Amino acid sequence: SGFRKMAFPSGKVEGCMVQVTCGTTTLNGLWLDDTVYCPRHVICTAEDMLNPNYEDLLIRKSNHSFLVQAGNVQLRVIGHSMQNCLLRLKVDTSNPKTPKYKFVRIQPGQTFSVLACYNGSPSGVYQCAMRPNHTIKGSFLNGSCGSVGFNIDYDCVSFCYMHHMELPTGVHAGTDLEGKFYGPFVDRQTAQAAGTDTTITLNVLAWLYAAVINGDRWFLNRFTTTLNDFNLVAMKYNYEPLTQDHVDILGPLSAQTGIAVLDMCAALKELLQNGMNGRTILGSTILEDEFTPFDVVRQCSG
Amino acid sequence: FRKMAFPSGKVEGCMVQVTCGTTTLNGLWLDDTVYCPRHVICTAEDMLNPNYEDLLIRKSNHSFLVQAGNVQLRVIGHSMQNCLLRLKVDTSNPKTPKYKFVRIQPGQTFSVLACYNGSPSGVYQCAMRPNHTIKGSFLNGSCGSVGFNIDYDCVSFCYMHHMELPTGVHAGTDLEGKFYGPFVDRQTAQAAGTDTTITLNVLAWLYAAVINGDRWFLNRFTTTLNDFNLVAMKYNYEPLTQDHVDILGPLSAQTGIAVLDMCAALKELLQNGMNGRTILGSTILEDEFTPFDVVRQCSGV
């Protein structure tokens, strides 16, 4: 009894952070085995950001151009290459602290923990969700470029995200561990806007279900609605429209609680048009949209 | 602005599984001692107002199964300190960090490493509520999960979880075994004072909003403490004491906004709502961010 957004223990990830400097620029690197991962824009010097040719800047540099520091001890860089927007430095020492890990690409709506790092040193950890416009909120303001996002499964650590830039709207944009961006974002300092900031409807429903499992129930109603009508309404309030696959994903949660998806939808529709009016659901005065149908199980369903 | 918890590595390396009889809960391993809730010695036949004293005597070091990973630690001594059990094990935790035991106060924040069976499962940032409780999300057997802060390289342990009150909120003790609030470790009626908003923290959050360029809500008029306090009580906000005004000084100093000015801004916001506008993104005010949190975080160095 008591729900709360939680991040994964950062322990195993903190032992993988390092510091990478090139010229006058310093940011976070990810040390796994004999490799350190970090944004390629580290080889860009402040003014070259307007429109860089990473291919050209990179060739004009040697292993000796890079300074990595495992905390205070320095690692020798004996190789460098570029995989998309990521820089891959081959080091002489294989990180003794390397955990079991995988590289995966997540989708908007999915959640993961972020270990906000400051110049190579761990500063804070938070749980967030990839927004529908492919960005990540959590205005973790600082020199955190290179901070990694991740999920911890059993013993395995799955890295899903790496931080690259702050968009001209706040919110952040990053890449997966293969160097491919999330969203229609480029590694430059050109004008760029992210899509519309919308609520993750799938997650909000997940949350209402969890609340139901948690004895909370005041918002429920005997009405049922169609997917279209519910979608027509949701959009007026800035909630993402619910696609068919989304309703499938709400399957299990719908098994327990014995509440049909379209039932819960009618409940949310009512909440949208009327409001909570001071009352709270599961503790907040606002709806939580960063909890996934899965999280709901990983913590409840059982 | 997103509230972060402290990285949990240093505390993870201090978590062990403690099992007595049929119960299994978490424990804190510092040097050669394991700290955990005394109610692990309870027996199913005695957890409805247990006689811990008796239950303690009827126990030897062998009743305890202390686990750290795949390795077992033989307990070689056991004593009680208030609501806590202190077990001396044969191994001195090689990972012990520099630490301190501190008694925190309502309104102050900390990170909680939610554990299950001696296993780090989740980590979060919360504030000790004004009625001496915390709104933790708790899974099965997370008792023993601790609260802490990280100041420099020193870990400040300030809380250990014991109970889940009838209200659903949580109650624990400091690392000396003494509860926070008028609660005891046993299934009893006991209720907590209603939950009120931490005014000091909201004011702290508005200062931080101002530091980050968000200031549309800054009114022009002023108010007294009495007047501000009356409006606050109206909206279920804890009253503001001189004590709290002094704590805001550093923030008042960096921004140039006198405390009574910010109380004037909050006062208007409460009496009028945010009109859909946002502050640091949220459409609602945050109260689990303290004055010191704003100094530490809003100062990268």
PDB file of all heavy atoms in Angstrom, chain A residues 24 30 36 38 40 67 77 122 146 150 191 198 200 207 221 249 293:
ATOM      1  N   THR A  24      39.510  21.890 -24.968  1.00  0.00           N
ATOM      2  CA  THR A  24      38.962  22.548 -23.801  1.00  0.00           C
ATOM      3  C   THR A  24      37.581  22.022 -23.368  1.00  0.00           C
ATOM      4  O   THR A  24      36.936  22.611 -22.489  1.00  0.00           O
ATOM      5  CB  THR A  24      38.853  24.046 -24.087  1.00  0.00           C
ATOM      6  OG1 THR A  24      38.242  24.695 -22.975  1.00  0.00           O
ATOM      7  CG2 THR A  24      37.996  24.289 -25.340  1.00  0.00           C
ATOM      8  N   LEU A  30      31.228   6.447 -21.088  1.00  0.00           N
ATOM      9  CA  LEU A  30      30.691   5.209 -20.518  1.00  0.00           C
ATOM     10  C   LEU A  30      31.741   4.136 -20.749  1.00  0.00           C
ATOM     11  O   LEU A  30      31.997   3.744 -21.884  1.00  0.00           O
ATOM     12  CB  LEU A  30      29.372   4.838 -21.214  1.00  0.00           C
ATOM     13  CG  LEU A  30      28.306   3.918 -20.576  1.00  0.00           C
ATOM     14  CD1 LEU A  30      28.241   2.630 -21.361  1.00  0.00           C
ATOM     15  CD2 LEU A  30      28.552   3.644 -19.078  1.00  0.00           C
ATOM     16  N   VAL A  36      35.259   3.179 -24.199  1.00  0.00           N
ATOM     17  CA  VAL A  36      34.618   4.296 -23.521  1.00  0.00           C
ATOM     18  C   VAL A  36      33.720   4.915 -24.583  1.00  0.00           C
ATOM     19  O   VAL A  36      34.180   5.199 -25.683  1.00  0.00           O
ATOM     20  CB  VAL A  36      35.628   5.365 -23.057  1.00  0.00           C
ATOM     21  CG1 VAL A  36      34.894   6.645 -22.613  1.00  0.00           C
ATOM     22  CG2 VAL A  36      36.455   4.807 -21.916  1.00  0.00           C
ATOM     23  N   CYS A  38      30.942   7.997 -25.751  1.00  0.00           N
ATOM     24  CA  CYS A  38      30.610   9.383 -25.440  1.00  0.00           C
ATOM     25  C   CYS A  38      30.192  10.076 -26.723  1.00  0.00           C
ATOM     26  O   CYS A  38      30.481   9.581 -27.819  1.00  0.00           O
ATOM     27  CB  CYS A  38      31.811  10.119 -24.806  1.00  0.00           C
ATOM     28  SG  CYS A  38      33.193  10.641 -25.923  1.00  0.00           S
ATOM     29  N   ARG A  40      30.010  12.384 -29.958  1.00  0.00           N
ATOM     30  CA  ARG A  40      31.100  12.791 -30.818  1.00  0.00           C
ATOM     31  C   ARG A  40      31.310  14.287 -30.784  1.00  0.00           C
ATOM     32  O   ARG A  40      32.377  14.773 -31.169  1.00  0.00           O
ATOM     33  CB  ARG A  40      30.888  12.324 -32.270  1.00  0.00           C
ATOM     34  CG  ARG A  40      29.699  12.924 -32.982  1.00  0.00           C
ATOM     35  CD  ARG A  40      29.565  12.353 -34.369  1.00  0.00           C
ATOM     36  NE  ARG A  40      28.417  12.950 -35.032  1.00  0.00           N
ATOM     37  CZ  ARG A  40      28.077  12.704 -36.285  1.00  0.00           C
ATOM     38  NH1 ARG A  40      28.801  11.864 -37.007  1.00  0.00           N
ATOM     39  NH2 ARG A  40      27.031  13.306 -36.812  1.00  0.00           N
ATOM     40  N   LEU A  67      41.668  12.625 -23.425  1.00  0.00           N
ATOM     41  CA  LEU A  67      42.026  12.402 -22.027  1.00  0.00           C
ATOM     42  C   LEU A  67      40.856  11.802 -21.223  1.00  0.00           C
ATOM     43  O   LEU A  67      39.891  12.483 -20.885  1.00  0.00           O
ATOM     44  CB  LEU A  67      42.499  13.723 -21.386  1.00  0.00           C
ATOM     45  CG  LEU A  67      42.783  13.740 -19.868  1.00  0.00           C
ATOM     46  CD1 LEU A  67      44.009  12.877 -19.542  1.00  0.00           C
ATOM     47  CD2 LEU A  67      42.968  15.191 -19.388  1.00  0.00           C
ATOM     48  N   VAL A  77      44.355   5.865 -23.988  1.00  0.00           N
ATOM     49  CA  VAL A  77      43.532   5.656 -25.166  1.00  0.00           C
ATOM     50  C   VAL A  77      44.459   5.250 -26.308  1.00  0.00           C
ATOM     51  O   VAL A  77      45.398   5.970 -26.665  1.00  0.00           O
ATOM     52  CB  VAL A  77      42.718   6.927 -25.488  1.00  0.00           C
ATOM     53  CG1 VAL A  77      43.548   8.160 -25.169  1.00  0.00           C
ATOM     54  CG2 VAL A  77      42.294   6.930 -26.940  1.00  0.00           C
ATOM     55  N   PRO A 122      29.137  10.984 -10.802  1.00  0.00           N
ATOM     56  CA  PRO A 122      27.696  10.812 -10.537  1.00  0.00           C
ATOM     57  C   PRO A 122      27.097  11.844  -9.587  1.00  0.00           C
ATOM     58  O   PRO A 122      27.548  12.000  -8.475  1.00  0.00           O
ATOM     59  CB  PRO A 122      27.625   9.402  -9.970  1.00  0.00           C
ATOM     60  CG  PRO A 122      28.755   8.696 -10.696  1.00  0.00           C
ATOM     61  CD  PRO A 122      29.866   9.714 -10.615  1.00  0.00           C
ATOM     62  N   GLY A 146      26.683  12.961 -21.948  1.00  0.00           N
ATOM     63  CA  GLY A 146      27.334  11.677 -21.788  1.00  0.00           C
ATOM     64  C   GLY A 146      26.652  10.832 -20.716  1.00  0.00           C
ATOM     65  O   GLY A 146      27.031   9.665 -20.517  1.00  0.00           O
ATOM     66  N   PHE A 150      19.069   3.850 -18.589  1.00  0.00           N
ATOM     67  CA  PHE A 150      19.193   2.403 -18.532  1.00  0.00           C
ATOM     68  C   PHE A 150      18.068   1.727 -17.757  1.00  0.00           C
ATOM     69  O   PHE A 150      17.251   2.384 -17.113  1.00  0.00           O
ATOM     70  CB  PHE A 150      20.551   2.073 -17.889  1.00  0.00           C
ATOM     71  CG  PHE A 150      20.645   2.487 -16.431  1.00  0.00           C
ATOM     72  CD1 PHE A 150      20.268   1.606 -15.415  1.00  0.00           C
ATOM     73  CD2 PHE A 150      21.021   3.781 -16.083  1.00  0.00           C
ATOM     74  CE1 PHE A 150      20.253   1.999 -14.085  1.00  0.00           C
ATOM     75  CE2 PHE A 150      21.010   4.200 -14.749  1.00  0.00           C
ATOM     76  CZ  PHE A 150      20.622   3.299 -13.747  1.00  0.00           C
ATOM     77  N   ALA A 191      18.742  25.580 -35.745  1.00  0.00           N
ATOM     78  CA  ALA A 191      17.408  25.733 -35.165  1.00  0.00           C
ATOM     79  C   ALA A 191      16.714  24.389 -35.177  1.00  0.00           C
ATOM     80  O   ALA A 191      16.670  23.729 -36.217  1.00  0.00           O
ATOM     81  CB  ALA A 191      16.582  26.746 -35.978  1.00  0.00           C
ATOM     82  N   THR A 198       3.066  16.023 -25.320  1.00  0.00           N
ATOM     83  CA  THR A 198       1.794  15.395 -25.017  1.00  0.00           C
ATOM     84  C   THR A 198       1.897  14.385 -23.869  1.00  0.00           C
ATOM     85  O   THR A 198       2.984  13.867 -23.570  1.00  0.00           O
ATOM     86  CB  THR A 198       1.232  14.678 -26.277  1.00  0.00           C
ATOM     87  OG1 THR A 198       2.188  13.709 -26.709  1.00  0.00           O
ATOM     88  CG2 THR A 198       1.004  15.659 -27.428  1.00  0.00           C
ATOM     89  N   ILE A 200       1.351  10.809 -22.039  1.00  0.00           N
ATOM     90  CA  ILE A 200       1.396   9.439 -22.507  1.00  0.00           C
ATOM     91  C   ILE A 200       0.179   8.719 -21.989  1.00  0.00           C
ATOM     92  O   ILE A 200       0.185   8.136 -20.887  1.00  0.00           O
ATOM     93  CB  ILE A 200       2.637   8.746 -22.005  1.00  0.00           C
ATOM     94  CG1 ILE A 200       3.850   9.633 -22.322  1.00  0.00           C
ATOM     95  CG2 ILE A 200       2.730   7.367 -22.634  1.00  0.00           C
ATOM     96  CD1 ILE A 200       5.073   9.333 -21.531  1.00  0.00           C
ATOM     97  N   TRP A 207      -1.497   3.516 -14.793  1.00  0.00           N
ATOM     98  CA  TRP A 207      -1.573   4.105 -13.474  1.00  0.00           C
ATOM     99  C   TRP A 207      -2.955   3.982 -12.839  1.00  0.00           C
ATOM    100  O   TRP A 207      -3.054   3.722 -11.637  1.00  0.00           O
ATOM    101  CB  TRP A 207      -1.183   5.583 -13.561  1.00  0.00           C
ATOM    102  CG  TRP A 207      -0.773   6.217 -12.261  1.00  0.00           C
ATOM    103  CD1 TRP A 207       0.306   5.880 -11.484  1.00  0.00           C
ATOM    104  CD2 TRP A 207      -1.408   7.328 -11.603  1.00  0.00           C
ATOM    105  NE1 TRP A 207       0.381   6.714 -10.390  1.00  0.00           N
ATOM    106  CE2 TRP A 207      -0.657   7.609 -10.436  1.00  0.00           C
ATOM    107  CE3 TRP A 207      -2.550   8.111 -11.886  1.00  0.00           C
ATOM    108  CZ2 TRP A 207      -0.996   8.642  -9.553  1.00  0.00           C
ATOM    109  CZ3 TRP A 207      -2.890   9.148 -10.995  1.00  0.00           C
ATOM    110  CH2 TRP A 207      -2.110   9.398  -9.845  1.00  0.00           C
ATOM    111  N   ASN A 221     -16.534   4.505 -13.072  1.00  0.00           N
ATOM    112  CA  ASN A 221     -17.943   4.763 -13.383  1.00  0.00           C
ATOM    113  C   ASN A 221     -18.553   3.594 -14.172  1.00  0.00           C
ATOM    114  O   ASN A 221     -17.832   2.781 -14.736  1.00  0.00           O
ATOM    115  CB  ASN A 221     -18.118   6.094 -14.135  1.00  0.00           C
ATOM    116  CG  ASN A 221     -17.438   6.103 -15.452  1.00  0.00           C
ATOM    117  OD1 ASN A 221     -17.458   5.113 -16.176  1.00  0.00           O
ATOM    118  ND2 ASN A 221     -16.833   7.228 -15.792  1.00  0.00           N
ATOM    119  N   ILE A 249      -1.719  -4.066 -25.250  1.00  0.00           N
ATOM    120  CA  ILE A 249      -0.756  -3.989 -24.177  1.00  0.00           C
ATOM    121  C   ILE A 249      -1.427  -3.844 -22.818  1.00  0.00           C
ATOM    122  O   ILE A 249      -0.850  -4.265 -21.809  1.00  0.00           O
ATOM    123  CB  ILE A 249       0.234  -2.832 -24.396  1.00  0.00           C
ATOM    124  CG1 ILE A 249       1.039  -3.070 -25.677  1.00  0.00           C
ATOM    125  CG2 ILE A 249       1.190  -2.738 -23.223  1.00  0.00           C
ATOM    126  CD1 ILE A 249       1.912  -1.878 -26.088  1.00  0.00           C
ATOM    127  N   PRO A 293       2.673  -0.017 -18.387  1.00  0.00           N
ATOM    128  CA  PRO A 293       1.821  -1.147 -18.027  1.00  0.00           C
ATOM    129  C   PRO A 293       2.682  -2.203 -17.349  1.00  0.00           C
ATOM    130  O   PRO A 293       2.224  -2.890 -16.432  1.00  0.00           O
ATOM    131  CB  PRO A 293       1.281  -1.605 -19.380  1.00  0.00           C
ATOM    132  CG  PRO A 293       1.123  -0.307 -20.114  1.00  0.00           C
ATOM    133  CD  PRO A 293       2.444   0.380 -19.790  1.00  0.00           C
TER     134      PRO A 293
END
